[PDB]
Amino acid sequence: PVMHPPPSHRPWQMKDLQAIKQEVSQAAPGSPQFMQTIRLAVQQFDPTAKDLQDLLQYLCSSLVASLHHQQLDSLISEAETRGITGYNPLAGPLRVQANNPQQQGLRREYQQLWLTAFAALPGS
Amino acid sequence: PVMHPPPSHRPWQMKDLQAIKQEVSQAAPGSPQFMQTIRLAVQQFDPTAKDLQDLLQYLCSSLVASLHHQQLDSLISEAETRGITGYNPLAGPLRVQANNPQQQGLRREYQQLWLTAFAALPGS
Amino acid sequence: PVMHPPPSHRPWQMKDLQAIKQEVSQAAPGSPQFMQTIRLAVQQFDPTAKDLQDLLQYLCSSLVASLHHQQLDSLISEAETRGITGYNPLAGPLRVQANNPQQQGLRREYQQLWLTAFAALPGS
Amino acid sequence: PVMHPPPSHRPWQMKDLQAIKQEVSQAAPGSPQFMQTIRLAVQQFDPTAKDLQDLLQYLCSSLVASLHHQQLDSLISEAETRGITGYNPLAGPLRVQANNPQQQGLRREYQQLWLTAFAALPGS
Amino acid sequence: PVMHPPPSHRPWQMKDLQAIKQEVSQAAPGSPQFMQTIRLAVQQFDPTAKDLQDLLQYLCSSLVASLHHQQLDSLISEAETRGITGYNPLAGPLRVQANNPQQQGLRREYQQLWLTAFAALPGS
Amino acid sequence: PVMHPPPSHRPWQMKDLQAIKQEVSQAAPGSPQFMQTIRLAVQQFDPTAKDLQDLLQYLCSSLVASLHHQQLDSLISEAETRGITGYNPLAGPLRVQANNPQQQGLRREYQQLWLTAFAALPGS
């Protein structure tokens, strides 16, 4: 999470992760209940690309996480071809820039692509 | 939530949302138990228009949320024709002004319209 | 609640309200268990007249709350005829003065009348 | 409780009271489990005479509380005839001095008499 | 517990004691699960000799506590004959020195003897 | 845990340990659920070599802990022959350097070897 007590990253807290997992204990990845829960968790904790990586591993199986990671990679290259806000194309990979706590605007764009990447899942 | 530790907005906390949802787990949107719970949550967290948007999505299904959003839109235009306190008609849409943490008086007026918009629901 | 970290009012916290309600989940309004619980809650949170209004609505049904509000109104007029401590009769209605965080002495008197107003209930 | 963040009294917190009650939910007043629990609560919260009064009312029925209050009154007069530490016999009733957060030594003596007063109970 | 926010002692917190007891709810004194739990509690709270006295009373029956207290008394005299670190033999009883928050090194030695004293128990 | 409020070590908190254990209550050491949980706990608490020692003892039986400790000892000597980052070969044993809160880079390397040492377990 990118804390806001100068943007500062702080690792996931197990008590926060446990609250998220139990809210989606009966929700397949991509389902409406799933998306609603992770959308609020993204809003609350303002996670970096690395944090979102960790959150996906914690909540979904390898097959699902593997597929989401792939879908997002395509979403990123599509978005880059399609135009992104706050994206300095000379500042390195989008995933690396989304780990810079300063680039909040970019990070928020990355979060939406990460959330959208779940669309490739049946949701059931 | 508009925190009061200069009015400052801070996103919804999942632990707060979870406490609200479980209090209305057996209460249809608009029912007496529902309204009592969200009235106290509005009082405690002083939510902005955007926060109230998020809270509605979290607690109600799309059909209910869609209808509430519509009812409130009519309530807003009715209230604007009917006279509102703290409303600068030149300062943009009421929903935008209700997101300015400074305009507390207006925000409180918006919260009551948001709460009243549940009246269009059978409550059962 | 009138917080004591200059007397400052802060709204009810849902986690505090939920703890009170579950302690009286099996206690009719006015019963010994009910009174014992709200007496300690009044002591802990030092609520204003408005706070006590909200607490009554949250814990009791409309019929009970309606009757308590009435009983207290008579208790207030009786107490005013009967003599009250810290009551400036020129400073407005007792209920308004009991919302001024400065008038702690008066507020404590109001709390006892609010607690006593439950006597009109069978307690079962 | 007499807090130690100059000795300062702060009222009982419902979350603390609830933890005490549930630890003795299956323990009659005066039983070994009862005494063990309240002895640690007295140690943790350093309660005044008034606090101990409130704690007794919260945990025991009127018949038990009535009897404990009586037993302690005799224990106090016995202790006064028998010699007490920190007791200024000219400074008012022992119960009043035990409410002065400054008189910690005396307060601790009062707590032990309050705890001992449970001996008049069968403990079962 | 000897807090480390100058070494300062603060009494046991009931919420901490309750967490310890429920971890060993199904573990006889001296069993592997018992020792593992209290070893971590000693590490976390850095208890004094008096604190360890209180913890033993809270977790074990009188027969067990009586025997542990005895075993430790022999362990102390054995350790004193056997050589101890941080032990000023002229500074009073080991138990008294282990209550001085300054003598951390000694206190840690006392904790290990207190833990070892459980060896006289069958553990089942 | 190496806290980050100058790197400072603070002992394990029982409430944190209890949350970890209950997340792996139905997960054999080395299983996917086990590794996922301890990987996030290592990330959150940044434990030293001594902390990881304690965590292993708390979560696994002696046979498992004994084997893990052995496997890691071989992993350490293998890694030392194989090249390590932040490792000053003249500054003492890797385990000792991994207890120095300053040597964060080294500590992170040690954590990964500690995590990898679970590979010798069947995971079921």
Experimental resolution (Å) = 2.1
Cα–Cα distance for residue pair B21/B29, rounded to 1 Å: 11
The two structure tokens encoding residue B61: 């299904």
Touching check for A88 and chain B: CB below 8 Å? no
Whether E11 and chain D come into contact, CB under 8 Å, resolves to: yes
The count of other CB atoms within 10 Å of the CB of residue D116 is 14
H/E element holding E76? Answer: helix E62-82
Structural element, H or E, at residue F22: helix F14-23
The enclosing H or E element of E114 equals helix E104-116
- Longest CA–CA span in chain D (Å) reads 43
CB A110 within 8 A of CB A84: no
Instruction: Kindly determine whether residue E40 and residue F14, on different chains, have CB atoms separated by under 8 Å.
Output: yes
Residue for token pair 């780990």 = A99
Q: Give the DSSP H or E segment for C2.
A: strand C2-3
Count of positions (residues) in chain D: 124
Distance separating alpha carbons of residues A119 and A56, to the nearest angstrom? 14
Count of CA atoms in the C-beta half-sphere (13 A) of B74: 10
Q: Can you tell me the distance from the alpha carbon of B50 to that of D87, in angstroms, rounded to the nearest whole number?
A: 62
Distance CA C100, CA C9 (A): 9
CA distances from E44 to E2, E3, E4, E34, F51 (A): 10, 10, 10, 16, 12
Give E79 to chain F, closest Cα distance, Å. Answer: 26
Way the structure was solved: X-ray
Q: Does D24 touch chain E (CB under 8 A)?
A: no
DSSP F82-123: H--TT--TTS--HHHHTT-TT-HHHHHHHHHHHHHGGGGS--
* CATH assignment at residue A6: 1.10.375.10
Q: Where is B8: in which H helix or E strand?
A: strand B8-9
Distance CA(C99)–CA(A55), nearest Å, equals 47
Residue B89 lies in a domain: yes
CA distance D109 to B85: 60
Q: Could you count the other beta carbons within 10 Å of the beta carbon of residue A15?
A: 12
DSSP codes, D57-122: HHHS-HHHHHHHHHHHHHHHHHHHHH--TT--TTS--HHHHTT-TT-HHHHHHHHHHHHHGGGGS-
In a domain, B1, yes or no: no
Please report residues of A whose CB lies closer than 8 A to that of F19. 14-15, 18
How far apart are the C-alpha atoms of A23 and A39, rounded to whole Å?
12
Q: What are the residues whose beta carbons fall under 8 Å from the beta carbon of A52, sequence distance 6 or more? A: A42, A110, A111, A114
Closest CA to E76 of E57, E97, E61: E97
Report the alpha-carbon distance of residue B7 to residue C54 in Å, rounded: 24
> With an 8 Å Cβ cutoff, are B43 and C12 in contact?
yes
Q: Which residue of C has its CA nearest to B33?
A: C58
Structure tokens at C89: 């009769």
Contact B17 A36 (CB under 8 A): no
Set of chain F residues whose Cβ sits within 8 Å of the Cβ of E16: 14
Is the separation of the CB atoms in F68 and F56 below 8 Å?
Answer: yes
In a domain, E1, yes or no: no
**DSSP code, position A99:** T
Q: Under an 8 A CB cutoff, do C13 and B43 touch?
A: no
- Number of domains forming the structure of chain F: 1
Helix, strand or coil for residue A85? Answer: coil
Give CA–CA dist B46/B16, Å, rounded.
Answer: 13
What is the widest separation between alpha-carbon atoms in chain C? 43
CA distance A68 to A118: 6
For residue F97, which of F79, F116, F82, F71 has the smallest C-alpha distance? Answer: F79
Are E58 and D40 a contacting pair at CB < 8 A?
yes
Q: Please, what is the Cα angle at D61 between D55 and D63, to 5 degrees?
A: 115
Question: Does an H or E element contain D8, and which?
Answer: strand D8-9
CA–CA distance, C14 with C2 (Å, rounded to integer): 16
D44 interfacial to chain E (CB closer than 8 Å): yes
Nearest Cβ partner for A41 among B14, B57, B62: B14
> C3, C8, C14, C22: best mutation site toward chain B, by most B Cβ within 10 Å?
C14
- Nearest Cα neighbor of B33 from B8, B58, B53, B59 is B59
Its domain, for residue D75, covers 2-120
- Please say whether the beta carbons of C122 and C34 come within 8 A: no
A13 touches F: beta carbon within 8 Å:
yes
Could you give the dihedral angle defined by the CA atoms of residues B48, B53, B56 and B57, in that order, rounded to the nearest 10 degrees?
A: -140
List residues in chain E that are followed by a break over 2.5 Å (C to N): 5
Min distance A90 CA to chain B CA atoms (Å): 32
3-class SS at B3?
A: strand
- List all chains that touch chain B, counting a touch as 3 or more CB pairs closer than 8 Å: A, C
